[PDB]
Amino acid sequence: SLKICVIGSSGHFRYALEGLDEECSITGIAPGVPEEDLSKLEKAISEMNIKPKKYNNWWEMLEKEKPDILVINTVFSLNGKILLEALERKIHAFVEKPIATTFEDLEKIRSVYQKVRNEVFFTAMFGIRYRPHFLTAKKLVSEGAVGEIRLVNTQKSYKLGQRPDFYKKRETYGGTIPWVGIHAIDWIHWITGKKFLSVYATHSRLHNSGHGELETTALCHFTLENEVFASLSIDYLRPQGAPTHDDDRMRIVGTRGIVEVINERVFLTDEKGHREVPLVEKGQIFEDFLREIRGQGKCMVTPEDSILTTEIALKARLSADTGQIVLIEGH
Amino acid sequence: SLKICVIGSSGHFRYALEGLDEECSITGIAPGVPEEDLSKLEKAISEMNIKPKKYNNWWEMLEKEKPDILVINTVFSLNGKILLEALERKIHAFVEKPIATTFEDLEKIRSVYQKVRNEVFFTAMFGIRYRPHFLTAKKLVSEGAVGEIRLVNTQKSYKLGQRPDFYKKRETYGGTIPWVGIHAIDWIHWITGKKFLSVYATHSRLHNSGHGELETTALCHFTLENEVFASLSIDYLRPQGAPTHDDDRMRIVGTRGIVEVINERVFLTDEKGHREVPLVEKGQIFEDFLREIRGQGKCMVTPEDSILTTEIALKARLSADTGQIVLI
Numbered sequence: 001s002l003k004i005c006v007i008g009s010s011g012h013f014r015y016a017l018e019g020l021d022e023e024c025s026i027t028g029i030a031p032g033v034p035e036e037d038l039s040k041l042e043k044a045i046s047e048m049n050i051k052p053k054k055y056n057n058w059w060e061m062l063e064k065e066k067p068d069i070l071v072i073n074t075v076f077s078l079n080g081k082i083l084l085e086a087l088e089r090k091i092h093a094f095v096e097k098p099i100a101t102t103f104e105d106l107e108k109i110r111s112v113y114q115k116v117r118n119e120v121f122f123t124a125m126f127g128i129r130y131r132p133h134f135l136t137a138k139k140l141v142s143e144g145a146v147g148e149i150r151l152v153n154t155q156k157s158y159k160l161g162q163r164p165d166f167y168k169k170r171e172t173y174g175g176t177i178p179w180v181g182i183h184a185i186d187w188i189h190w191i192t193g194k195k196f197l198s199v200y201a202t203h204s205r206l207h208n209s210g211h212g213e214l215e216t217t218a219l220c221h222f223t224l225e226n227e228v229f230a231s232l233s234i235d236y237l238r239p240q241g242a243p244t245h246d247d248d249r250m251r252i253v254g255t256r257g258i259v260e261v262i263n264e265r266v267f268l269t270d271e272k273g274h275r276e277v278p279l280v281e282k283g284q285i286f287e288d289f290l291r292e293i294r295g296q297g298k299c300m301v302t303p304e305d306s307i308l309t310t311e312i313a314l315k316a317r318l319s320a321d322t323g324q325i326v327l328i329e330g331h
Numbered sequence: 332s333l334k335i336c337v338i339g340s341s342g343h344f345r346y347a348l349e350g351l352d353e354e355c356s357i358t359g360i361a362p363g364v365p366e367e368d369l370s371k372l373e374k375a376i377s378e379m380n381i382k383p384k385k386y387n388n389w390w391e392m393l394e395k396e397k398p399d400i401l402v403i404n405t406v407f408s409l410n411g412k413i414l415l416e417a418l419e420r421k422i423h424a425f426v427e428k429p430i431a432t433t434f435e436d437l438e439k440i441r442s443v444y445q446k447v448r449n450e451v452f453f454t455a456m457f458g459i460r461y462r463p464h465f466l467t468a469k470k471l472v473s474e475g476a477v478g479e480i481r482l483v484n485t486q487k488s489y490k491l492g493q494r495p496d497f498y499k500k501r502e503t504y505g506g507t508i509p510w511v512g513i514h515a516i517d518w519i520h521w522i523t524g525k526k527f528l529s530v531y532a533t534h535s536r537l538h539n540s541g542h543g544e545l546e547t548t549a550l551c552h553f554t555l556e557n558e559v560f561a562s563l564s565i566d567y568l569r570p571q572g573a574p575t576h577d578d579d580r581m582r583i584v585g586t587r588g589i590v591e592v593i594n595e596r597v598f599l600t601d602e603k604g605h606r607e608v609p610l611v612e613k614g615q616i617f618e619d620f621l622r623e624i625r626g627q628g629k630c631m632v633t634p635e636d637s638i639l640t641t642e643i644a645l646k647a648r649l650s651a652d653t654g655q656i657v658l659i
Binding site for chain 2: 148150151153155157200202204206207216217218219221223226227228229230231233235237238239240241242243251253254255256257258269270271272273274323325
């Protein structure tokens with residue numbers, strides 16, 4: 001079977017809980033920092049009849065539980081440092097994004113992983129890919145529905161509201177482009193299969209509702225291979241009165257047609273006209289992760305994707321902090 | 332009454348035709364250049380019961396017909412040269428966008444216009460503003476439905492197809508940023524009422540279906556006052572098989588709400604939820620222009636707007652031709 005431990009309750013640990021099978025058990029949980037609020041995790045756990053040991057000290061949990069798999073979702077700046085530990089201990093890791101908040105932390109993860117990659121797998125929690133509307137978008141693109149991709153637009157818009165204090169310092173938060181925008185950077189990379197050449201980005205922390213250094217708006221412009229451009233519009237300004245927490249959108253413009261993801265639905269315009277497209281069946285990220293660990297399949301969100309998209313997010317944030325175009329390729 | 336001459340057939344002359352009343356008459360038409368195809372214009376006037384004298388060149392038409400209003404829509408690089416002439420002669424002009432394809436022409440127009448502005452009026456063919464969905468978005472934002480604006484997204488997507496040959500060269504075309512994109516530049520300016528501070532933009536002519544130097548795709552990133560950002564996605568890649576020629580969109584994100592224009596409809600999202608908004612009655616750009624000339628009201632697309640949005644468009648094209656952030 002597989003023994004799984006969890007550190008933190010500050011991210012999308014639900015992706016892991018919803019992917020558990022009969023050959024997994026969660027044997028331990030721990031906060032990443034002493035005062036981390038474990039409410040959401042602890043409530044979710046009881047509701048499924050599983051009884052893990054609670055530790056105060058995650059390091060001690062690692063030594064005692066010896067898990068095969070670690071789910072990491074704590075203070076955002078700390079996720080990367082715990083990931084590095086997991087990799088050195090050769091514990092497979094399922095880690096919240098971004099997988100690092102500083103270039104130095106990322107370079108350590110990438111260097112170390114290169115040395116241990118034959119023995120340990122990891123990947124980030126890019127669960128949105130697995131929703132029916134994103135899988136369908138990918139399916140169409142792959143089967144030639146838009147022909148050759150020329151232009152991509154993406155949108156992230158989330159309800160902000162009350163968040164843990166660590167969101168208010170850049171040092172622990174890592175910025176809104178890496179936190180929110182990275183989902184869309186991963187969509188772009190995944191859907192185009194193209195290399196990113198450069199980024200120009202801006203962000204603003206004006207009107208952030210007392211959230212300190214947190215950015216409420218950002219806009220990124222990416223140049224990819226073959227003169228393909230992508231825009232990424234980010235806001236933490238989805239009004240409290242909107243029906244859902246999120247408004248994810250993607251538009252993919254090609255030589256033959258245009259695919260749009262909007263409102264959890266997919267539309268296609270081509271030589272035939274404009275129509276809504278029926279959706280493929282949903283996937284589940286942790287089930288895919290587990291298949292990778294068991295040798296039953298390949299997880300489509302790869303460690304290389306997880307490193308690369310974090311790199312791009314940190315480069316976009318650098319661009320926004322310095323008001324300069326930042327090169328990604330060759331770097 | 333009022334006498335109107337038209338120069339060219341390569342632009343949105345129908346804005347003018349559809350704004351006529353009984354106190355107007357098209358008396359003269361002329362090509363902007365020797366070989367300019369005037370079929371479109373000629374088909375339209377004849378279908379209307381209008382018999383205007385056609386001239387070999389426009390400058391003789393000006394000499395003879397002494398028009399009150401010049402409607403300028405010829406080869407795009409030329410529109411600004413002709414406008415310059417109209418202003419110097421103090422003829423009111425309704426001119427296609429962009430009003431100039433070079434900084435040099437734009438600057439001449441600014442110089443000359445400051446001279447004659449108390450006597451002569453011009454503006455550019457920004458007719459999309461007058462559609463019910465844009466008028467409604469503008470009223471909602473201006474009334475406070477989104478609170479303070481923070482972020483603006485805009486989209487232009489047009490069917491390309493077969494076009495006059497002057498589209499194929501940058502020198503006569505002016506580029507897809509100033510031809511297609513300028514509509515959205517104007518929307519951003521009008522809706523936010525804020526100054527543009529800088530633009531970063533890219534464009535590409537790959538897979539342009541044999542349209543020579545014409546760019547099929549462009550992306551513009553604007554910074555405005557008060558750290559407001561605006562994006563502008565531009566394509567000539569709306570598939571021929573699409574049901575309409577266009578897919579204009581605008582999304583205005585503010586501190587208290589979001590207004591979206593999409594598929595010619597308007598949606599508002601705030602504290603009370605999301606809903607579709609009933610649209611105000613259409614306007615019509617040439618009617619608005621005519622009230623201005625007749626002292627009956629002010630035209631909402633101003634000469635100053637017209638200069639400023641062409642300035643921004645040329646700046647965005649400069650950024651896209653150089654790879655550099657451009658200060659405005």
